[PDB]
């Protein structure tokens, strides 16, 4: 039941490590999951729906980790607060590089993937802006740019920069340097006058 | 001769304002250019080659404008120096939103488009890093992050943020606010300690 669905998703995630979704057939997913092709269509309408499901799981994993941080503040300085938050995305998406890569590509062809990404980016930007606003209200950060616009640019920077690093794009920040790079830009732009 | 080639390119740029390249046929380009479909194939091997050419023109337009700034420094403060440079990309790509949008999408399917974008991003990042390094050498900027890694993240932020704004993506910075937003992040991250 749910056993076969998880097998399809595990097969898809593993095959995406080796080739794009365009190079994966429904028969590949069924064969790797130990089922027939008609049985596959009971669980998923298409291979694109499998990727949508995988991306939904990764994005909710990141969101739930951020929710955990929000409820459990780490007793540390302000730079470490931002670093621990950026690390949620570095670690979660960096642990699922193949699904991350395929998911971003699917944005151009799937309105469901595009809407899923848009929905969570809006949530993450709104939370970023709320934390910036809290830092301004306590007097720690200066009232410079509108917080929501600053939050938008910083979140888009992280999206583009993390995903370029994971994909080994030319140009990209080395994966071993990208966390420090992003933290620097966040902290200077949020606290700098 | 070159008259017909420019007509094909002008037709393509105008049709891209209304629908994606997938929805444009070679007959559409030929008809709008006043030629037959076989005559089109004399000038271009495919509609994708037309887009590649359009993107090449826009990217070189931006590069040449940046070269002009580099040779003709504006007598103004440091924040205005960075703003005038970011504006090259804001104005050049914002004046060709349809080609910009189609060109970024083609990166996923055209190795020639992907290599073209990669080549110029490497050039722009190297120049950004050289300007940061010059500011550090004269004592105006602190020696914080490696300049090339900082330059990479800032250039990727501008790519993602400008193109989201031009496309009216959800989420995005309003086009009327994006220049100020990016300038703030560049100046604070380059000069902040
Ligand atoms: O990194 C972010 N978003 C995205 N990265 C790549 C895909 S989108 C960050 S860091 C960070 C720190 C915080 F204290 C609060 C929120 C926050 C967020 Cl939201
Ligand atoms: O904006 C840039 N790059 C890209 N924007 C979107 C596509 S890529 C900027 S601003 C800027 C200022 C400078 F003084 C020197 C370089 C420079 C560059 Cl390079």
Author numbering:
A (entry chain A), B (entry chain A): 22 to 214
List sentences from the manuscript.
The discovery of this transcriptional regulator led to the notion of controlling EthA expression levels by targeting EthR and thus boosting the bactericidal effect of ethionamide. EthR binding site is characterized by a long hydrophobic tunnel surrounded mostly by hydrophobic residues, many of which are aromatic, plus four polar amino acids and a basic residue.
We then managed to obtain X-ray crystal structures for compounds 1, 2, 3, 5, 6, 7, 10, and 12 bound to EthR. The EthR-compound 1 co-crystal structure confirms the occupancy of the compound in the EthR binding site. Compound 1 is active against both EthR (IC50 ≈12 μM) and InhA (62% inhibition at 100 μM), confirming the computational predictions. Interestingly, this compound was identified solely from structure-based predictions. Thiophenes and thioethers are present in compounds 1, 8, and 10 and are known to be substrates for EthA.
